[PDB]
């Protein structure tokens, strides 16, 4: 329900900040509009230790939230790598869902097969929600979605609520920024600026 | 080894490879989709373990595994985990984090003309990677591919090939004596095989 172990969220957030999968710059934001946070979880694939922490994290939270799972599907293309390793560890069939046809489901999925979709980052959620929709159109019984990280944007919760799809994440914005402060990546000011950004990606610098 | 044989066996049984010499597709007598292997745990492990063993023997000094977008990425990820090595992948430019001069082995699903991978190879080098070579699951053994690879001076290794697969197809009863020779002709020339 929402995430996995409180300690997994903490450890992963720690790792994301250390290897620089997540950058925090409250004082000099990047551009979209202006954002104090930037994330590329594809970086985690280059650090075996962190990668293993994340993939084991996936396997564990899947067993808790979606134990009935029969097929692991990765979201093209940032989610595929994680999904592959996950499927290997759990010795389950792997499939992957494309942005659009070249029939977006690659691999072999039988009608009704229970599927968990893997995503690396949840921002608005639109990408994975489209992957979910496509899988459902092709016959899959999508138990839900599991992602490495989420910005906890209200929009995302709204999109997921409306589509009725269950989402679980290894770590989250709230816990990451709390850890960021403790670990010295940001100061008091930065922390409040980051909280502001989550509540409104427009008036946080005001 | 029996690896090429064993893999061909699997490819035919799960329908990753489809042989239809008496009624080609639209004209080819073979249809191949190895992304299908990803759905069969045991065949997938057979393949990934195959990759690992082949990589150890051909490119033991490998430092980073790179998958070709996007059919190669899954195989590369598993390979990289099994060998506890860093993983990166090339788009169509390198996703992940590769350091200058890092010894890389690029992973590919199928080798038809070998144009896709070679471009991936080219791009990787352009970004500072020392590509040791390429390893793919299967290859049609097209003369064009051998040429392309010979020119670009890139070493290639496959887990299984067209010749082995068709030989196995005959033995296993997927094709008869006529289909077999028809498949050999297709390899020699995609135009005048019939």
How far is it between the farthest Cα atoms of chain A? Answer: 52
Length of chain A: 206
Chain A residue closest in CA terms to B16: A107
Between strands B103-111 and B64-68, the pairing is parallel
Q: Do B70 and A52 touch (CB under 8 A)?
A: no
Q: What does the buried/exposed string (b/e) look like for A114-139 if buried means 16 or more CB atoms within 10 Å of the residue's CB?
A: ebbbbbbbbbebebbbbbbebbeeee
Q: Looking at domain A1-206, which CATH architecture does it have?
A: 3-Layer(aba) Sandwich (3.40)
How far apart, in whole angstroms, are the C-alpha atoms of residue B62 and residue B64? Answer: 6
Chain A residues interacting with chain B (CB cutoff of 8 angstroms): 42-43, 45-48, 51-52, 55, 71, 74, 76-77, 80-85, 87-88, 91-96, 106-109
Q: Residue B26, SS3?
A: coil
What does the block give as tokens for B134?
Answer: 């390429």
DSSP designation for B94: E
Domains in chain A: boundaries = 1-206
How far apart, in whole angstroms, are the C-alpha atoms of residue A192 and residue B59? Answer: 51
Q: Can you give the resolution of this entry in Å?
A: 2.4
Residue A195 host element (H or E): helix A188-199
- The DSSP code sequence of A88-114 is HHTT--EEEE-SS----EES---TT-E
Which one, of A2, A26, A24, A29, lies nearest residue A13 by Cα? A24
How far apart, in whole angstroms, are the C-alpha atoms of residue B164 and residue B166? Answer: 6
Q: Is the peptide bond before B70 cis (omega within 30 degrees of 0)?
A: yes
**CATH code linked to domain B1-194:** 3.40.50.2020
Enumerate helices (H) and strands (E) in chain A, giving the number of each: 7, 11
Residue holding tokens 């070998």? Answer: B114
Residue A73 host element (H or E): strand A71-75
Q: What order do you get walking across the sheet with A105-106 strand by strand?
A: A2-3, A167-169, A141-150, A114-122, A71-75, A94-97, A105-106
Q: Residue B141, SS3?
A: coil
Q: Do B81 and A74 touch (CB under 8 A)?
A: no
Distances (CA, A) of A105 to A125, A145, A165, A204: 19, 16, 18, 40
How far apart, in whole angstroms, are the C-alpha atoms of residue B136 and residue B107? Answer: 6
- Kindly report the backbone phi and psi dihedral angles of residue A90, in degrees, each rounded to the nearest multiple of 5, phi listed first: -90, 5
Q: Could you count the other beta carbons within 10 Å of the beta carbon of residue B154? A: 19
Residue A133's contacts (CB-CB under 8 Å, 6 or more residues apart) are A163
Report yes or no: B116 and B88 within 8 Å, Cβ to Cβ. Answer: no
What does the block give as tokens for A64?
Answer: 């808790």
Q: Do A80 and B77 touch (CB under 8 A)?
A: yes
Which one, of B44, B37, B3, lies nearest residue B17 by Cα? B37
- Kindly report the backbone phi and psi dihedral angles of residue B95, in degrees, each rounded to the nearest multiple of 5, phi listed first: -90, 125
Q: What order do you get walking across the sheet with B87-90 strand by strand?
A: B94-95, B87-90, B64-68, B103-111, B130-139, B156-158
- Kindly report the backbone phi and psi dihedral angles of residue B13, in degrees, each rounded to the nearest multiple of 5, phi listed first: -70, -40
Q: Residue B190, SS3?
A: coil
What does the block give as tokens for B160?
Answer: 């299984």
Q: Could you count the other beta carbons within 10 Å of the beta carbon of residue A204? A: 20
| Opening angle at CA B29, ends B24 and B31, nearest 5 | 100
Tell me the β-bridge partners of A106: A96
Q: Torsion over CA of A154, A18, B83 and A128, rounded to 10 degrees?
A: 10
Method used to determine the 3D structure: X-ray
- The DSSP code sequence of B37-93 is GGG-HHHHHHHHHHHHHHHHHH-TT--EEEEETTTTHHHHHHHHHHTT--EEEE---
Residue holding tokens 């050999």? Answer: B184
B-interface mutation test, from A71, A108, A110, most B Cβ less than 10 A away: A108
Q: Which residues of A are annotated as a binding site for orotate?
A: 123
Distances (CA, A) of B180 to B30, B55, B113, B139: 11, 31, 22, 17
How far apart, in whole angstroms, are the C-alpha atoms of residue A188 and residue B47? Answer: 51
Residue B105 host element (H or E): strand B103-111
A-interface mutation test, from B14, B18, B32, B74, most A Cβ less than 10 A away: B74
Which one, of A140, A151, A99, lies nearest residue A117 by Cα? A140
Chain A residues whose CB is inside 8 A of the B87 CB are 45-46, 51, 81
Among the partner residues A45, A80, A93, nearest to B70 by beta-carbon distance: A80
DSSP designation for B28: B
Report yes or no: A152 and A172 within 8 Å, Cβ to Cβ. Answer: yes
How far apart, in whole angstroms, are the C-alpha atoms of residue B186 and residue B194? Answer: 8
What sign for the dihedral angle of Cα B170, B176, B178, B182?
negative
Among the partner residues B38, B75, B80, nearest to A95 by beta-carbon distance: B38
Report yes or no: B126 and A73 within 8 Å, Cβ to Cβ. Answer: no
| Opening angle at CA A163, ends A160 and A166, nearest 5 | 55
Q: Do A84 and B95 touch (CB under 8 A)?
A: no
Which one, of B116, B141, B109, B88, lies nearest residue B44 by Cα? B109
Residue B181, class by beta-carbon neighbours within 10 Å (0-12 exposed, 13-18 middle, 19+ buried)? middle
Q: Residue A153, SS3?
A: coil
Among the partner residues A45, A80, A82, nearest to B96 by beta-carbon distance: A45
């Amino acid at each position: 329900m929402g995430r996995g172990s409180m300690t997994l969220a903490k450890d992963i957030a720690r790792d994301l900040l250390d290897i620089k999968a997540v950058y925090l710059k409250p004082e000099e934001p990047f551009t979209w509009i202006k954002s104090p946070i930037y994330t590329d979880n594809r970086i985690t694939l280059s650090y075996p230790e962190t990668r293993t922490l994340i993939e084991n994290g996936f396997v564990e939270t899947i067993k808790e939230a979606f134990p009935e799972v029969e097929v692991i599907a990765g979201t093209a293309t940032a989610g595929i790598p994680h999904g592959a390793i996950i499927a290997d560890k759990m010795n389950l069939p792997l499939a992957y869902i494309r942005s659009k046809p070249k029939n977006q489901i690659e691999g072999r999925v039988t009608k009704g097969q229970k599927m968990v979709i893997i995503e690396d980052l949840i921002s608005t959620g639109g990408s994975v929600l489209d992957a979910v929709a496509a899988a459902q159109r092709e016959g899959a019984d999508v138990l839900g979605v599991v992602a490495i990280f989420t910005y906890e944007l209200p929009k995302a919760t709204a999109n997921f609520e409306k589509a009725s799809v269950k989402l679980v994440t290894l770590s989250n914005y709230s816990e990451l920024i709390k850890v960021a402060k403790v670990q010295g990546y940001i100061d008091a000011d930065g922390l409040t600026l980051l909280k502001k950004f989550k509540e409104n990606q427009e008036t946080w610098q005001d």
